[PDB]
Amino acid sequence: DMNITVELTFFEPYRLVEWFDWDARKKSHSAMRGQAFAQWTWKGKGRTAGKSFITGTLVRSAVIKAVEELLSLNNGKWEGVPCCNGSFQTDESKGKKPSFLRKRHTLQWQANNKNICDKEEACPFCILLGRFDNAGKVHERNKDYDIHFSNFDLDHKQEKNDLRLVDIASGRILNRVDFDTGKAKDYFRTWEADYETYGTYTGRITLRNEHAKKLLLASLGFVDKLCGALCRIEVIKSEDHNDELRKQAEVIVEAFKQNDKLEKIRILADAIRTLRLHGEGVIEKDELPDGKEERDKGHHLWDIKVQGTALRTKLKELWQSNKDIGWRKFTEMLGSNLYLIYKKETGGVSTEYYSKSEGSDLFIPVTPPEGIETKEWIIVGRLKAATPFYFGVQQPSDSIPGKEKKEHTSFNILLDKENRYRIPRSALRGALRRDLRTAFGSGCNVSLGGQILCNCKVCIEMRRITLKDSVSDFSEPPEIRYRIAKNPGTATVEDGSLFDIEVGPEGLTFPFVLRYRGHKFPEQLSSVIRYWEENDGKNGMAWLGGLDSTGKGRFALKDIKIFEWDLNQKINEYIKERGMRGKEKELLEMGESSLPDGLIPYKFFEERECLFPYKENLKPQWSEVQYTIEVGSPLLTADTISALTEPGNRDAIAYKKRVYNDGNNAIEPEPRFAVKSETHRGIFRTAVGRRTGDLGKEDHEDCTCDMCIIFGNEHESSKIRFEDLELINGNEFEKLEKHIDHVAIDRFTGGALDKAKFDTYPLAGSPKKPLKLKGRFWIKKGFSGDHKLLITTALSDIRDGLYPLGSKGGVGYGWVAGISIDDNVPDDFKEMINGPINNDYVHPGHQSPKQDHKNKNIYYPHYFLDSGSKVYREKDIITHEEFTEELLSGKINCKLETLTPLIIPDTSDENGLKLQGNKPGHKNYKFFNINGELMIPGSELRGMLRTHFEALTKSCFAIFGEDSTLSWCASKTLGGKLDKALHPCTGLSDGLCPGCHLFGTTDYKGRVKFGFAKYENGPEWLITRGNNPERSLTLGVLESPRPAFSIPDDESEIPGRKFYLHHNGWRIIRQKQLEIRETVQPERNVTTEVMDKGNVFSFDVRFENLREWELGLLLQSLDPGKNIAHKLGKGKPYGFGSVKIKIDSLHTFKINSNNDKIKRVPQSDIREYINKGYQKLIEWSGNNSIQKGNVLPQWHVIPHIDKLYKLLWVPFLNDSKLEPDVRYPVLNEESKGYIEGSDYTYKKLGDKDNLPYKTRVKGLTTPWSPWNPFQ
RNA sequence: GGGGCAGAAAAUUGG
RNA sequence: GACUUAAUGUCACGGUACCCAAUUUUCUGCCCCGG
Ligand SMILES: [Zn+2]
Ligand SMILES: [Zn+2]
Ligand SMILES: [Zn+2]
Ligand SMILES: [Zn+2]
C-alpha cells in the first residue's frame, strides 16, 4: 500500500531521443528507432531548452524481464512461494494490442502451483504483471493499479532555469560495416548524454499487495542495462570570445595583405593549431625562433609588422586579452578563424538507413533443462596502444543535437568532454563481432528489419556479452599528420591533395571490462581473448578504429583477470553487490582475500596452444614481415609546420613522434625519429604499380587489377597493412642532425641569386655509420603466388636502390644501402627474397696566344660563351608511370681526381677550426664532413653537370634573376635584355628544353639522380709552413660580380653564360700568405682547409627512362676527353678546384623481361651511344653537309662546342712546359700588388678612347684572348 | 673604399 | 502535480563513421670594378 522511492544511476553514456506521443511517432524514423531510450521534451518555443525523462513502461519491461530470469533460475520459486508461467498473448477480437509487441524468447518453467490464477487469489508473478486489476490499456484515475510505475525525472542538483540540449547531449554518427568488403553500407545518428553531471533519475513505484514485495525488491537489483548503459537501481527511505578573436584575426589578415603575403596566412593558421602542443611559455618567455644575426628583418614570419609592431608581441597582447578561455581553446579558435578568413578572402568557401510491421506475430516459449547451471564470468584488464590510434568523428557544427535538419582539420578524433581519449562501446562490439565471425568460420550479415531473432552462432554468443566504454587518464592534445597524393605522370604533387588527420599517442592505457552470462564459457571467445592479448613472443592483434590500412589502431590486452559467479547458489550476493557494476576498477587492484562473497577466480581458462578456433582460424589471418633498412646518406622527411614553431630558424627539419610512457605517466622527454607508414606504403604501391603497369589507368572504378586487389580501392579494403619505420641506432651518434645549406647560382653573373639561399637539417648518415630503420607490414590470408611475387619484387626494388626515402633524392638524400630480413619471417618469403672506359679525344687548344709563348701574357679569369637564341622544346614529355622497353635505365660508377687544390667548405660552423678569439669577425671553415668522413655533396656535382649539359645542348637559362637593373640610368631590367626563348620554362604547355627534360622543373621531376661522393685515397691536406693550422690557407678578397662591365652602352645584349679558366694561380696565394694576413682586414677574407692534388673521390649516378642520345650526351658531359676538365668549389678565379671525372662502370637493367638483370655494357655499346648523341647535335645544328659513318667524332666542327672546349682546356696536364698567368686588373694605380710598367689597370681599360665598348665585349666573348697587350 | 642573398613558385582536399 | 508515460508482450549491448591517396618537384654556399 506504501510507496517506494527509486533512484537509478548511470555508469556509462546513455542515449536520448525526441518525444512524439504515439501517432506522430510513426511519421519520424529516429523516434521509432529511438524507443527504449531516454526521452527529451522541449519546454517553451524556440527549440533550445527542455527536460529529459525515462518512461515508466520501460522500467516496467526491465523489471518484468528480471523477474522472469530470476524465476527461471530458481525453477519457478522464490523464497518458497511458487509462481505460474504468466500470460503474454492478447487476442485481437477482445481488446486491443498493448502498444508494444515482443519478438524475443519467453522463459517458461514447469507450473507446479496446481491452481489456476483468478482475481481472488494470485501468484506474485501475476500480481506483478498486473493481470487482475481494474486498469488496462486506457488510462483512468491513478488508483486501482495494483502495481504502478511513475515516470523518472532528471535530478538536477542546483535549482536554476531550464536546461539546454547542447549542455546535456552530443550528436554522433554510427555505422554498419560489411564483412566481405570492409566498407560501410549505411549510417544513422544518435544523441549521447553525459553521466558525470546528468546521470541520476528519481521515481516512484506503488505496490498495493504485500505478497510480491520481496520479488520486486530482488528484481530491482538484477536490472543491468537501461537506455544503452550500465545502471544501478537503489531504494531510498562565448559569442563575444568568437567575435573578439575574429576582429583580431581580420587585423592580422589585412596586415599580411598590406605586404602582399596572403598565401603565408594559411600556413600561419596551421602553426597556431600546432601551438596547442607547447605551453603558454612559448608566447610568455618568447621562445619563438629568432632571425639571423645582424639582419634588419628577423624571422620571415614572426617579424611581419601588424599595425606597427611585430607578430609575437601582437600574440602576447592578444593572449593577455583572452586569458580567460584557456590556452587550448584560444589556439584552436584562432586557427579555425584564420582558416575561415583566408577561405573568404581567397574567393572560395570550403545512405542514411534506420530499421523498420503488420503480420507474423508469434509466441515462442523456451524451457531450459532442469539440471543445467547458469554462471556469470567477468574479464577485467587493460588495453594498450601499440601504434597510434584513430577513432573517427564528424565535424563540429555538424554534430549539433538540435539543429540536425539539413573545416581546418579534415578529420578529428573522438574525445570526452574533459578532453580525454575514448574507446566507444560500438567500436569494441564491432571488433568483437568481426573476430568472433572469423573464429566461428561462418556468420550472417546483420539484418535490421527483423521479425524473427537470428539463429546464427555469432548472434547467439553476442546476445550474452556486455561491454563497457573506456576513457583514459590523459588529456593532452593530439598530433596532426599530413598526407598528399602524387601524380604518377610527372612525379609531383597532384592538385587538391593535401589533407590532415588527428592521431593519438602510442602506449596509452584504457580499462577493459567484459561480461558473459551463460551455461559454459565458449572456446571461440577464449580464442578471441587469447588472440587479443600479448605475452613473451606474441604481440597483440586487436584492430580497433578506422585507419587500419595505414597501420593505425593495433591494441594489445594485458593484466587479464577472469572471475566467476555462481547464480544457482549465490544469487543474493549478486543482488546485494549489484554485479560489481561501476566498481570494476577496484577488481584489478583487489587481493584474493578482499573479494566479495560468491565471486571466485576462474582456473580452467584454456591456454593458447589448447584452443581449436585459435591456430586454425585466427592465427593464420595476418602474417608479419619485419625488416631493417640501412640508409647510408642523409635522410630528410620534412615537416614544414613544426619547423616554424621551434627554435633554430630552419626551413626543413626531420619528423618526430611522441611516445607515451606507462611506468611514469608523463609522455617522454625525448622524441622518436621515424618515417611514416603512409610513405613506405606509397613506396610499395608505386613500385608494384610501375612493375605491372596499372598506374597508367585513368580510373579505378569497378576495377579488378592487381594493384586494386593488393592495395584496395573505393569498393574494397586493403589486403596489406603498413606500420612506421623507427630509428633504432640513434644513440650511436654524437650530433645526430647535420646542418647543410644550399644556394642557386645565376648562369650569367656566376654568383648567388637573390632570395635563393636555404637550409636543410637531415639526420647524419654515412657509408661507414649508416642509419638503421626497423619496420613491419602485415599481409592477409588468401594471397596468390603472383601477388607474393609482386611484393617480393617490390622489396628487391627497394633494396637495389630505385626508390629513395624522403625528400631531395636527386641530390643524394635518403639512398637505401641495404635491407635485412629477420628470421621469424615465413620461409617462402625468405626463399623468394634471398675495364676502364676512356674517351681518347685530344682537343687542340688556343694556339695563337698561348702555345707559342714563354709566359709573358695576362689573361682574364672568366669569359662568356655566346650561343644563338633558338631552343628546341619537346611537347611529348617522357612520363614516370612505367618502365618503357625502348628506353634505358641504370647506374654509372664514376671517380673524381683533383688536378688543382679543392675547397668545399662546411658552413654549419662559422668558427670551425679556431681563430675567432685572436682575430674576431674572421670566418674560418673546415672541409665537408659527416661523422668525420670527407665528402662532396651531390648538389654541387649536379649543378656543375647541369651547367655543362645546358651549355652543350643550347638550352634555356634555368636560374636567372630578371629583376636586376643597371646603372652607369637604364631602359629596362635585364630580363628584358634577354631573348624570350632563353627564358626559364614555365609550365608544360609550351614544352621543355633538353636541360629541363633531363634534370627537371617544378612541375616535372628529373630523370637523373646524383649521389654523395666519398673519399677513397690520396695525399690530403696541402701543408703550408707559416700558418696556425698547417692544413689551412687564407684566401684573397672576393665580392660580387658586376654586370656593368659586361654590358655597358644600353644598346647591348647579355653575352651568354660565364665560365672560368684553368690555371695554377694558387701558388701566388700560397707564397704571399704573410702579405694577406696583414694589410687586409680580417672581416673581408676567409680561412679554409684545402685538399692537395691527386686525391680520389667516388660517386654514383642513377638514371631511368633515358633515350640513347641522352645517355650518350650524359657520358660525354661526364668525361669529355683528355685535356678537358671541370671546375668545382670555392676560389675558381684564383685557380682552385680543377677536377677530372673518369667513368669506371655502366650498368643497365630491364624490368619488363622476367628473368633478366643488371649488365656490364661493354665499350662498343657506349661508343654507339656517344655517336648517337653526336648525330643528334648535328641534326639540331642544321648543317647536314657532314657525312655519316663509324668515325670517332671530332667535336670541334660545331662552333659552340669548340668555344666550350676551349674554355675548359687544361694547359698543364701531360708535361707540356707552359703555365699561363691569369689574374684580375688592379683598379687605379697606387693600389696594392701592381707591377711597375704593366699598365693593367681598370682606368685604362674602362675608358672609351682606348679600348672602346665593342672591342671590350668582343674580348670578353673570345676565349683565351690576351688582355695585357690586348690581342 | 665596400660586403650581398639568407628562401621563392605550386597543391591546403576529392571520390 | 501538470509539463511527460500506459500496463497480460520493447533482441536496439540488432548496426566499428568505415573505404581509397609517398609533405613532395626544381636550385653548385657562391662571388670584382669603381662609390
Ligand atoms: Zn500466476
Ligand atoms: Zn546473426
Ligand atoms: Zn585498378
Ligand atoms: Zn628549359
Is A985 labelled as part of a ligand binding site?
A: yes
Length A1245 CA → C16 C1' (Å): 83
| Cross-strand bridge partners of residue A280 | none
One-letter amino acid for residue A191 of the chain = W
| A1085 Cβ contacts chain C strand, under 7 Å | no
Nearest nucleotide (CA of A497 to C1'): B13
**Nearest to residue A561, comparing CAs of A382, A383, A379?**
A379
First to last CA, chain A: 130
Other beta carbons less than 10 A from residue A483's beta carbon: 15
Q: At what angle do helices A263-274 and A239-258 cross, to 10 degrees?
A: 140
Q: How far is CA A1033 from CA A22, A1077, A1223, in A?
A: 97, 10, 19
The backbone region for A1199, taken as left when phi is positive above 0, alpha when psi lies in -120 to 50, beta otherwise, is: alpha
Length A551 CA → C14 C1' (Å): 30
Q: How far is CA A440 from CA A444, A518, A647, A782, in A?
A: 11, 18, 56, 18
The Cα A525–Cα A440 span in angstroms is 10
- Strand A652-653 to A752-761 pairing: parallel
The Cα A1073–Cα A1066 span in angstroms is 11
| DSSP per residue, A837-885 | -----PPP--IIIIIS-SS--EE-SEEEE---S----BSSPPPSSS--S
Q: Any residues with CB less than 8 A from the CB of A796 and at least 6 apart, and which?
A: A833
The Cα A377–Cα A980 span in angstroms is 83
Q: Any residues with CB less than 8 A from the CB of A409 and at least 6 apart, and which?
A: A273, A480, A500, A502
Give, for A215, the enclosing helix (H) or strand (E). Answer: helix A213-219
Residue nearest C24, CA–C1′ metric? A493
For the record, the C-alpha cell of A460 comes out as 547467439
- Strand A1086-1089 to A816-821 pairing: unpaired
The Cα A563–Cα A174 span in angstroms is 32
Contact (Cβ atoms closer than 8 angstroms) between residue A864 and residue A1056: yes
For the record, the C-alpha cell of A367 comes out as 524451457
Unique residue bearing C-alpha cell 566504454 = A469
Strand C bases, protein C-beta under 7 A: 1-35
One-letter amino acid for residue A1034 of the chain = T
Is A610 labelled as part of a ligand binding site?
A: no
Other beta carbons less than 10 A from residue A248's beta carbon: 20
Rounded (10°) CA dihedral A872, A875, A880, A885: -80
**Nearest to residue A250, comparing CAs of A206, A314, A298?**
A314
The Cα A472–Cα A419 span in angstroms is 10
Backbone discontinuities in chain A, residue before each (C to N > 2.5 A): 237, 350, 356, 406, 834, 968
Rounded (10°) CA dihedral A243, A245, A246, A251: 130
Contact (Cβ atoms closer than 8 angstroms) between residue A949 and residue A1114: yes
Q: Any residues with CB less than 8 A from the CB of A1235 and at least 6 apart, and which?
A: none
Q: Any residues with CB less than 8 A from the CB of A665 and at least 6 apart, and which?
A: A473, A474
For the record, the C-alpha cell of A31 comes out as 523516434
The Cα A418–Cα A1007 span in angstroms is 53
Q: How far is CA A551 from CA A554, A628, A676, A1160, A1186, in A?
A: 7, 18, 10, 41, 63
Shortest-distance ligand to the CA of residue A459: 2
Shortest-distance ligand to the CA of residue A983: 4
Contact (Cβ atoms closer than 8 angstroms) between residue A695 and residue A689: yes
Q: Which residues in A715-742 are b (16+ Cβ under 10 Å) and which e?
A: ebbbbbbbbbbbbeeeeebeebbbebeb
One-letter amino acid for residue A487 of the chain = N
Q: Which residues in A32-53 are b (16+ Cβ under 10 Å) and which e?
A: ebbebbbbbebeeeeeebbebb
Q: Which residues in A1082-1091 are b (16+ Cβ under 10 Å) and which e?
A: beebbbbbbb
Length A106 CA → B10 C1' (Å): 68
| DSSP per residue, A48-71 | SEEEEEE-HHHHHHHHHHHHHHHH
For the record, the C-alpha cell of A1268 comes out as 695585357
Contact (Cβ atoms closer than 8 angstroms) between residue A721 and residue A743: no
Contact (Cβ atoms closer than 8 angstroms) between residue A926 and residue A909: yes
Strand C close residues, chain A 36-55, CB < 7 angstroms: 36-37, 41, 43, 51, 53, 55
Contact (Cβ atoms closer than 8 angstroms) between residue A953 and residue A994: yes
Nearest nucleotide (CA of A1003 to C1'): C25
Ligand 4 center to A956 CA (angstroms): 5
Contact (Cβ atoms closer than 8 angstroms) between residue A959 and residue A753: yes
- What backbone phi and psi angles, to 5 degrees, belong to A766? -135, 155
Length A103 CA → C11 C1' (Å): 7
| Cross-strand bridge partners of residue A625 | A777
3-state secondary structure of A596: coil
The Cα A972–Cα A1059 span in angstroms is 26
Contact (Cβ atoms closer than 8 angstroms) between residue A700 and residue A714: yes
Length A912 CA → B6 C1' (Å): 20
Length A202 CA → C7 C1' (Å): 20
Nearest nucleotide (CA of A649 to C1'): B6
The Cα A357–Cα A76 span in angstroms is 33
Q: Any residues with CB less than 8 A from the CB of A426 and at least 6 apart, and which?
A: A174, A175
The Cα A315–Cα A330 span in angstroms is 11
Q: What angle do CA A1249, A1253, A1257 make, to 5 degrees?
A: 145
Q: How far is CA A229 from CA A380, A542, A606, in A?
A: 18, 24, 31
The Cα A1000–Cα A491 span in angstroms is 11
Q: How far is CA A339 from CA A265, A343, A344, A1120, in A?
A: 8, 6, 9, 55
The Cα A143–Cα A145 span in angstroms is 5
Ligand 3 center to A503 CA (angstroms): 29
The Cα A589–Cα A367 span in angstroms is 40
| A721 Cβ contacts chain C strand, under 7 Å | no
Contact (Cβ atoms closer than 8 angstroms) between residue A391 and residue A427: yes
Strand C close residues, chain A 83-102, CB < 7 angstroms: 86-91, 94-95, 97-102
Can you point out the beta strands (E) in A899-956? 923-924, 929-930, 933-936
Taking a 5 Å cut-off on Cβ, the residues next to ion ligand 3 are: A 700, 703, 705, 708
Ligand 3 center to A36 CA (angstroms): 46
Q: How far is CA A1249 from CA A66, A367, A676, A994, A1256, in A?
A: 117, 124, 69, 43, 12
Ligand 3 center to A712 CA (angstroms): 9
For the record, the C-alpha cell of A687 comes out as 613500385
Contact (Cβ atoms closer than 8 angstroms) between residue A630 and residue A770: yes
Q: How do the residues of chain A divide into helix, strand and coil, expressed in percent and rounded to 5?
A: 25, 25, 55
Resolution in A: 2.9
Length A924 CA → C30 C1' (Å): 16
Q: Any residues with CB less than 8 A from the CB of A305 and at least 6 apart, and which?
A: A255, A259, A311
Contact (Cβ atoms closer than 8 angstroms) between residue A1088 and residue A1066: no
Contact (Cβ atoms closer than 8 angstroms) between residue A407 and residue A399: no
Nearest nucleotide (CA of A294 to C1'): B6
The Cα A97–Cα A88 span in angstroms is 11
Strand C close residues, chain A 1212-1231, CB < 7 angstroms: 1224-1225, 1227-1228
Q: A894: burial class by Cβ within 10 Å (0-12, 13-18, 19+)?
A: buried
The Cα A246–Cα A242 span in angstroms is 6
Contact (Cβ atoms closer than 8 angstroms) between residue A1109 and residue A1175: yes
Q: How far is CA A302 from CA A261, A464, A533, in A?
A: 13, 60, 49
| A806 Cβ contacts chain C strand, under 7 Å | yes
Length A289 CA → C26 C1' (Å): 27
Alpha-carbon radius of gyration of chain A:
41
Residues in chain A: 1271
Which parts of the protein come within 7 Å of strand B, by CB position? A 263, 266-267, 270, 292, 294-295, 300, 343, 350, 410-411, 484, 492-499, 649, 651, 701, 714, 743-744, 751-759, 1002, 1037, 1039-1040, 1081, 1083-1084, 1227, 1231
- What backbone phi and psi angles, to 5 degrees, belong to A976? -80, -20
Contact (Cβ atoms closer than 8 angstroms) between residue A901 and residue A1091: yes
The Cα A232–Cα A225 span in angstroms is 9
| Cross-strand bridge partners of residue A893 | A1100, A1145
Taking a 5 Å cut-off on Cβ, the residues next to ion ligand 2 are: A 444, 454, 456, 459
Technique used to solve these coordinates = cryo-EM
Length A36 CA → C6 C1' (Å): 15
The Cα A162–Cα A260 span in angstroms is 51
The Cα A256–Cα A304 span in angstroms is 8
Residue nearest B2, CA–C1′ metric? A1039
**Nearest to residue A726, comparing CAs of A640, A628, A802?**
A628
The Cα A846–Cα A129 span in angstroms is 118
Other beta carbons less than 10 A from residue A326's beta carbon: 11
Length A485 CA → B11 C1' (Å): 10
The backbone region for A86, taken as left when phi is positive above 0, alpha when psi lies in -120 to 50, beta otherwise, is: left
Q: Any residues with CB less than 8 A from the CB of A606 and at least 6 apart, and which?
A: A523, A526
Contact (Cβ atoms closer than 8 angstroms) between residue A563 and residue A599: yes
The Cβ-side half-sphere exposure at A20, using a 13 Å CA radius, reads 14
| A1122 Cβ contacts chain C strand, under 7 Å | no
Q: Any residues with CB less than 8 A from the CB of A221 and at least 6 apart, and which?
A: A233, A575, A576, A578
Can you point out the beta strands (E) in A1090-1150? 1096-1106, 1126-1127, 1138-1148
